Amino acid sequence: MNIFEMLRIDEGLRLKIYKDTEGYYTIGIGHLLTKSPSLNAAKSELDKAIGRNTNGVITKDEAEKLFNQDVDAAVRGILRNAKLKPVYDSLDAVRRAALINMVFQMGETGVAGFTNSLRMIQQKRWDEWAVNMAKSRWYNQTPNRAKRVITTFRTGTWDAYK
Numbered sequence: 001m002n003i004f005e006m007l008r009i010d011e012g013l014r015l016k017i018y019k020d021t022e023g024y025y026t027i028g029i030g031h032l033l034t035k036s037p038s039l040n041a042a043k044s045e046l047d048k049a050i051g052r053n054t055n056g057v058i059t060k061d062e063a064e065k066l067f068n069q070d071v072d073a074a075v076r077g078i079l080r081n082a083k084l085k086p087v088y089d090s091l092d093a094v095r096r097a098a099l100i101n102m103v104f105q106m107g108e109t110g111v112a113g114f115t116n117s118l119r120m121i122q123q124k125r126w127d128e129w130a131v132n133m134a135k136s137r138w139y140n141q142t143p144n145r146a147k148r149v150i151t152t153f154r155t156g157t158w159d160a161y162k
Contacts, residue, residue, distance in 0.1 A: 001158040003071060003097045007104055009161060010145045013063055017042055017056045021142060028063035030104065031070060074100050077108040084112055087121055098153035106138060121153075130154040 011030030025042035033045040120129040139146040151160040
């Protein structure tokens with residue numbers, strides 16, 4: 001198990017534009033196109049991201065290319081962030097992967113804002129962190145995926161993905 005395998009499981013793979021639980025247009029492996037209710041705007045974002053007239057449908061290779069880009073941005077985001085970097089630096093590899101998954105999903109700013117959450121992680125208070133994250137919108141909105149990530153983060157094992 002690795003970060004790629006982990007997120008692919010969590011986000012699935014769709015070759016055509018779709019709406020997520022929140023109603024946002026997305027494609028590929030968790031790639032957010034736009035928060036606008038316009039499908040046409042979404043189509044425009046896709047074409048610009050892909051570099052071709054897609055008509056709302058991409059190939060697997062294209063999905064994979066957006067995926068590599070997104071995972072990369074997430075790692076670089078952690079690493080450039082003043083609040084996230086030290087957190088990352090203090091963890092083992094499995095827990096690092098869980099943090100990447102959260103940033104990938106919620107974005108840098110999003111994660112960097114869970115002040116208390118971060119502190120717990122820093123103090124190594126695993127269980128409390130876990131209990132705590134379960135109160136988030138994130139967890140209430142997509143409980144199964146969240147539960148997988150939270151468990152991963154908490155235990156430092158890939159058990160939830162097995």
